[PDB]
Every structure is written in C-alpha cells, then in structure tokens.
Amino acid sequence: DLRLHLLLNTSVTCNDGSPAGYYLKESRGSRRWLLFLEGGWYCFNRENCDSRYDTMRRLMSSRDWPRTRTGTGILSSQPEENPYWWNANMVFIPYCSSDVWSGASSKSEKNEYAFMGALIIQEVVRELLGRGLSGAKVLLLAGSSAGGTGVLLNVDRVAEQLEKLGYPAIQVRGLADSGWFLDNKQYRVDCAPTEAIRRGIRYWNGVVPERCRRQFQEGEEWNCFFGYKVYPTLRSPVFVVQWLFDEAQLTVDNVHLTGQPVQEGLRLYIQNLGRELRHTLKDVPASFAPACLSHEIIIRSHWTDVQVKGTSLPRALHCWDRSLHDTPLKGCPVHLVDSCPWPHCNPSCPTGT
Ligand SMILES: O=C1N2c3ccccc3C[C@H]2CC1(F)F
Numbered sequence: 014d015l016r017l018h019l020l021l022n023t024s025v026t027c028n029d030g031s032p033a034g035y036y037l038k039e040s041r042g043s044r045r046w047l048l049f050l051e052g053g054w055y056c057f058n059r060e061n062c063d064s065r066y067d068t069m070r071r072l073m074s075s076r077d078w079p080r081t082r083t084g085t086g087i088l089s090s091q092p093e094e095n096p097y098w099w100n101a102n103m104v105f106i107p108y109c110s111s112d113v114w115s116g117a118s119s120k121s122e123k124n125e126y127a128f129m130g131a132l133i134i135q136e137v138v139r140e141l142l143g144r145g146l147s148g149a150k151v152l153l154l155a156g157s158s159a160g161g162t163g164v165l166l167n168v169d170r171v172a173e174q175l176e177k178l179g180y181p182a183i184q185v186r187g188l189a190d191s192g193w194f195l196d197n198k199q200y201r202v203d204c205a206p207t208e209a210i211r212r213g214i215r216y217w218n219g220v221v222p223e224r225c226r227r228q229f230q231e232g233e234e235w236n237c238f239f240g241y242k243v244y245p246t247l248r249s250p251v252f253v254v255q256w257l258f259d260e261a262q263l264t265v266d267n268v269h270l271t272g273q274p275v276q277e278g279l280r281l282y283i284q285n286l287g288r289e290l291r292h293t294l295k296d297v298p299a300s301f302a303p304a305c306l307s308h309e310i311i312i313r314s315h316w317t318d319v320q321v322k323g324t325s326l327p328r329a330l331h332c333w334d335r336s337l338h339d340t341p342l343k344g345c346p347v348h349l350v351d352s353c354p355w356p357h358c359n360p361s362c363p364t365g366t
C-alpha cells in the first residue's frame with residue numbers, strides 16, 4: 014500500500030482549493046524513484062468543470078481521498094506483478110487539477126478553480142527530497158493518459174528543478190503511457206483536442222516546455238500537448254508507450270466502434286490512424302506500441318502480458334535501463350512498434366475481459 018501525504022505547502026491545491034498530495038511507499042536501500050501521474054481527461058471552462066465537480070470530484074478535490082492506495086502494475090512492489098522496478102520507491106500523484114498537468118493558476122476572486130498541475134509536480138518533488146529523494150540515482154516520471162501527456166510537458170522541468178536545487182546527479186527520465194495523441198481529422202461543445210486544449214491553456218494558465226514554447230510561440234502553445242511535436246524538443250530520456258489504436262484517440266476522432274460491421278471508409282480511417290502513429294514513432298528510440306484497441310497500460314495488474322515482437326513492456330523498460338548505463342543490446346530491444354495494420358492483429362492484446 015502507498016500512504017497519502019497532503020502537501021505541506023497548502024498554496025499548491027487541487028481544483029477546489031483543497032491541498033494536493035501524493036501517495037508514497039518507500040523502499041530504503043533503493044535509489045530508484047518512480048513518480049506516477051494519474052490521468053483522467055480534463056475540463057476547460059466553467060460549465061464543464063462544474064459538471065466534472067459533480068460526478069468526478071476525486072479528480073478535482075482531495076476532500077474524499079482515501080488514506081492509502083494499492084500499488085498495481087509498475088507501482089506494484091511484488092516482482093511477480095512488476096518485473097521491472099518492484100523494489101523502487103513508489104509515488105502515485107493523484108490528478109486533481111484537470112489541466113493535463115500544465116496549470117499554474119490559483120483559485121482567486123478571478124478564478125473559480127485552481128489549475129496547478131505543473132506546480133503540484135514541482136511541489137511533490139520538493140517535499141520528497143526530504144523523504145529520501147535527495148539520495149536518488151534515477152527519478153522516473155511516469156504517467157498514463159493525461160498523465161502521460163503530463164510526463165512530456167513536465168519531465169524537463171523536473172530535471173531543471175533538481176539541477177537548480179543542487180542535485181545534478183539525479184538522472185531524470187520520462188515514461189509516457191497513452192499520452193501520445195494525433196491532431197488528425199475526425200472520422201466525423203463538450204471536442205477536437207486542438208480546440209479544447211487551445212481554450213484550456215488560456216483557462217488554466219497552462220505552461221509548456223520552454224524549447225517547445227519557443228518554437229510554436231505565443232498563442233500556439235497547444236501544439237506542445239501533442240507528443241510528436243513536443244518530444245523532439247525534450248532533453249530528458251523519454252520512453253513512449255502508445256497503443257496504435259488508442260481508445261481515447263478514437264473517441265476524440267468521433268469513432269464509436271459498435272460491434273457492427275466496419276465499412277470501407279471506417280476501415281481505411283482506422284488503418285490510416287495506426288499508420289500515422291507508427292510513423293510518428295519511427296525516430297523514437299525507446300517506444301512500445303502494440304496494435305491493439307485499448308487505453309493505458311502501465312498500472313494495470315496484467316501489464317506484463319502484452320508483447321511486441323515477443324518482448325513484453327517490463328522487459329523493454331529493463332532494456333531501456335541497460336541502454337542508459339554509462340550500441341544496441343543483443344536480444345534486449347527498446348524500440349518495439351507493431352507493423353500489423355488492424356486492432357488485435359497482435360495476439361497478446363488485452364482481451365477486455
Ligand atoms: O489525455 C487525454 N487527451 C489529450 C491530451 C493532449 C492532446 C490531445 C488529447 C486527447 C485527450 C484524450 C485524453 F483525455 F485521454
């Protein structure tokens with residue numbers, strides 16, 4: 014179990030002004046730290062944030078958070094469930110800022126909600142330094158869905174934080190799961206990701222990585238929420254996990270797979286989507302992209318089951334670790350992208366059971 018700690022700096026808040034926090038399981042005698050960013054969509058104006066506050070309040074408030082959570086998948090401390098990093102110090106950072114972890118805005122008499130995702134990450138890191146993070150050799154900032162996009166937006170800022178706090182020896186790395194989206198045309202008010210993100214950044218006072226901001230410049234920072242555009246600007250090593258037919262991608266593309274027969278137009282659309290993902294990952298050396306219709310991987314208890322070209326994700330991550338030791342490795346690959354063109358053409362895809 015991971016134990017809740019609310020942030021001692023109570024200026025760093027969830028949407029409703031309640032303090033943000035993190036869940037921690039320490040592992041003494043490990044110098045590895047895993048900081049996982051929860052996902053869960055976002056909201057981008059008063060009305061849809063109000064709706065979220067009614068029926069998704071744990072994603073906007075710590076008022077009702079339990080005092081413990083069970084680590085699962087890459088957050089599990091059992092080798093049987095987590096072959097990769099079972100002995101690491103484990104941190105789960107709840108997503109309660111609804112801003113894809115980009116916000117730097119307080120609740121005030123101008124702002125009904127606080128959007129502090131970028132500041133929550135920095136404050137968690139700061140308070141962990143006194144809990145043992147000061148002794149770390151590797152800090153892996155991981156995340157799923159909106160949390161995976163959050164990794165891309167924040168991994169280099171965590172690296173700069175630690176460098177400026179005087180810890181240049183801590184190697185910061187990113188693991189972005191299911192956060193690599195395409196600003197493609199839809200198959201056919203509440204949205205095209207580009208337009209919703211555009212509005213969100215203004216509403217959240219969202220921040221993006223500096224090099225990416227300098228490329229796209231004022232008014233165009235929404236571009237930096239799309240992995241294939243922000244990744245090449247990053248300096249920290251980032252491992253990208255993305256289903257080729259991601260369910261959230263299909264949802265924002267207005268594809269609703271019904272079990273009904275798939276007509277030619279939709280078949281071509283889905284095949285072209287998988288081809289475009291594959292293309293965006295061609296020059297991503299550390300990646301795991303199975304040809305499945307699914308969403309999120311790394312905190313699922315059966316995350317060990319999926320394989321690409323016979324290599325599981327825990328193995329690929331272990332190979333990544335080896336590759337960052339101070340030339341490719343025989344039989345221990347890090348770039349694993351399916352080439353087959355239809356969901357579940359890979360037999361190891363999740364069953365949905
Ligand atoms: O994280 C998520 N999304 C996101 C983030 C940045 C850019 C585009 C998107 C799509 C949306 C789906 C989500 F809610 F799963």
Ligand SMILES: *[C@@H]1O[C@H](CO)[C@@H](O)[C@H](O)[C@H]1NC(C)=O
Nearest residue numbers: 022023024025132133135136
């Ligand atoms: C609390 O966090 C805010 C936002 O990052 C920061 O400006 C402030 O200095 C912090 N307070 C303390 C006591 O560290």
